[PDB]
Amino acid sequence: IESDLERAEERAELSEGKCAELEEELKTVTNNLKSLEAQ
Amino acid sequence: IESDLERAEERAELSEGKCAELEEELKTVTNNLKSLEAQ
């Protein structure tokens, strides 16, 4: 169960980092879309 | 350790669910941006 918990924490950290990066990417993409939609 | 694994799996699977929703949101907004920029 300890061996289970360590890899569970590792994948959780990886997923959280990926989610944060994708949230930043979403913010940038929607900012560019809003800027381009003016024309 | 069992309790730790339980709530770890809980918020982990919540994280991948949110990540998948964010992935599809990025895909659709990118498609919309490409469609607008095509013309």
Swiss-Prot record, chains A, B:
Record PTM Phosphoserine, positions in chain: S3, S15, S35
Subcellular localization: Cytoplasm, Cytoskeleton
Signal peptide: none
Taxonomy, superkingdom: Eukaryota
Domain remark in the UniProt entry: The molecule is in a coiled coil structure that is formed by 2 polypeptide chains. The sequence exhibits a prominent seven-residues periodicity.
Family listed: Belongs to the tropomyosin family.
Role description: Binds to actin filaments in muscle and non-muscle cells. Plays a central role, in association with the troponin complex, in the calcium dependent regulation of vertebrate striated muscle contraction. Smooth muscle contraction is regulated by interaction with caldesmon. In non-muscle cells is implicated in stabilizing cytoskeleton actin filaments.
Protein name: Tropomyosin alpha-1 chain
Gene name in the database record: TPM1
Residues of the full protein shown: 172 to 210 of 284
